[PDB]
Design a protein around this motif. Structure first.
Motif, PDB file in Angstrom:
ATOM      1  N   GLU A 238      18.548 -10.731 -26.904  1.00 29.19           N
ATOM      2  CA  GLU A 238      17.816 -11.226 -28.070  1.00 29.19           C
ATOM      3  C   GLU A 238      18.429 -10.692 -29.359  1.00 29.19           C
ATOM      4  N   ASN A 239      18.689  -9.388 -29.384  1.00 30.94           N
ATOM      5  CA  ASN A 239      19.292  -8.741 -30.545  1.00 30.94           C
ATOM      6  C   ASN A 239      20.628  -9.391 -30.888  1.00 30.94           C
ATOM      7  N   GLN A 240      21.534  -9.411 -29.910  1.00 30.89           N
ATOM      8  CA  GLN A 240      22.841 -10.045 -30.088  1.00 30.89           C
ATOM      9  C   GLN A 240      22.676 -11.468 -30.608  1.00 30.89           C
ATOM     10  N   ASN A 275       6.975  -5.887 -31.386  1.00 34.27           N
ATOM     11  CA  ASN A 275       7.751  -4.664 -31.657  1.00 34.27           C
ATOM     12  C   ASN A 275       9.109  -4.553 -30.935  1.00 34.27           C
ATOM     13  N   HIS A 276       9.912  -5.612 -31.012  1.00 32.35           N
ATOM     14  CA  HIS A 276      11.256  -5.610 -30.438  1.00 32.35           C
ATOM     15  C   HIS A 276      12.088  -4.451 -30.986  1.00 32.35           C
ATOM     16  N   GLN A 277      12.950  -3.895 -30.142  1.00 34.73           N
ATOM     17  CA  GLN A 277      13.707  -2.697 -30.489  1.00 34.73           C
ATOM     18  C   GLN A 277      14.674  -2.909 -31.658  1.00 34.73           C
ATOM     19  N   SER A 278      15.231  -4.114 -31.766  1.00 33.83           N
ATOM     20  CA  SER A 278      16.273  -4.403 -32.755  1.00 33.83           C
ATOM     21  C   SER A 278      15.818  -4.155 -34.190  1.00 33.83           C
ATOM     22  N   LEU A 279      16.440  -3.178 -34.846  1.00 30.94           N
ATOM     23  CA  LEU A 279      16.130  -2.869 -36.238  1.00 30.94           C
ATOM     24  C   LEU A 279      16.268  -4.103 -37.116  1.00 30.94           C
ATOM     25  N   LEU A 280      17.385  -4.810 -36.945  1.00 29.75           N
ATOM     26  CA  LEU A 280      17.725  -5.970 -37.764  1.00 29.75           C
ATOM     27  C   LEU A 280      16.520  -6.879 -37.955  1.00 29.75           C
TER      28      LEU A 280
END
Length: 313
Positions: A238-240, A275-280
């Motif tokens: 997801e982040n990528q 609250n997904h981990q990805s800061l972005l």
């Protein structure tokens, strides 16, 4: 020009082909094929006979073997489940290293997928070993293998020896192909744009669109996103993905950017909700949400944001 005539003719064809009189078979088969526009057997005899016909040189071998290659495929297309044509066809792929390289890499697997269906009903390790050896031997086709290995192709159901991984690799393949493709475009383009008009970055990014507009990577990313179904990998992918998505935003023009941006904002908010981990996600979420006054903005979310990431500035 009759049924018994064609039968007897093909008999005469195959009996002559059995004698290793290839120059004769190539001659006789064409006649029958001329009589009966499409004939399952004539095409096979023609194919094998032409393929085996000796080559004084490379050009003749090439033309001869292409012609040979066509009639097998035609014979295989004509009759879906007949193993003679197919089994004869793939032996030609194994026999001639050129065959896979001359035929569209897509078409190869496209033939395989059809093969496997009949192979399943009739009898299949040879195909797997042979094709795997092809993937290992020739590495260029990695693009194709992962395209059909991805769920939703005849080969996906046929073989499928995980699809999620097999699909993940494709994303990176296409991604790398795009990145490397853009670089060659960079050189000639960047010279056009001036040294210091402030929109230099954007001007350079705008030229990159031609390669992205045709690229259907995002959808593949979505699919990969959904099928993963494992918390960590799901989040990372997801982040990528989001990183890609915003790359595309940098890529696309002003008109399209706005139309698309609602989607990415909705996406980021959706992430922030879970609250997904990805800061972005969080970062962009807070930057992008515009607040009338600084005294009416969300209070616990930013506290959870800080608590979650006390390193983020």
């Amino acid at each position: 020009d009759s049924m018994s005539d064609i039968k007897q003719l093909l008999k005469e064809a195959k009996q002559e082909l059995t004698n290793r009189d290839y120059e004769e078979t190539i001659e006789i088969s064409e006649k029958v094929l001329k009589l009966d526009p499409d004939n399952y057997f004539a095409h096979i005899f023609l194919g094998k006979a032409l393929s085996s016909l000796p080559a004084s040189n490379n050009v003749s071998s090439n033309r001869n073997l292409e012609r040979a290659t066509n009639h097998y495929v035609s014979a295989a297309k004509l009759v879906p489940d007949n193993l003679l044509a197919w089994k004869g066809l793939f032996l030609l792929f194994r026999t001639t290293e050129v065959v896979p390289d001359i035929l569209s890499y897509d078409e190869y697997f496209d033939l395989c997928g059809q093969y496997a269906d009949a192979l399943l009903k009739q009898e299949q390790v040879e195909l797997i070993n042979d094709i795997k050896l092809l993937k290992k031997t020739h590495p260029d086709c990695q693009k194709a293998f992962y395209q059909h290995l991805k769920p939703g192709s005849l080969m996906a159901e046929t073989i499928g020896r995980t699809p999620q991984d097999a699909l993940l690799n494709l994303i990176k393949i296409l991604s790398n192909i795009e990145t490397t493709e853009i670089g060659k475009t960079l050189s000639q383009n960047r010279l056009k744009l001036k040294a210091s008009d402030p929109d230099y970055q954007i001007k350079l990014n705008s030229f990159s669109w031609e390669i992205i507009k045709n690229s259907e990577i995002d959808q593949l990313y979505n699919q990969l996103v959904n099928i993963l179904a494992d918390d960590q990998k799901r989040s990372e992918i997801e982040n990528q993905w989001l990183e890609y998505r915003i790359k595309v935003l940098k890529s696309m023009p002003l008109d399209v950017k706005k139309d698309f941006f609602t989607k990415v904002k909705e996406m980021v908010e959706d992430m922030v909700l879970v609250n997904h981990q990805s800061l972005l996600a969080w970062q962009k979420y807070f930057e992008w949400t515009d607040y009338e006054d600084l005294d009416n903005m969300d209070a616990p979310l930013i506290i959870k944001y800080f608590k979650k990431f006390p390193k983020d500035p």
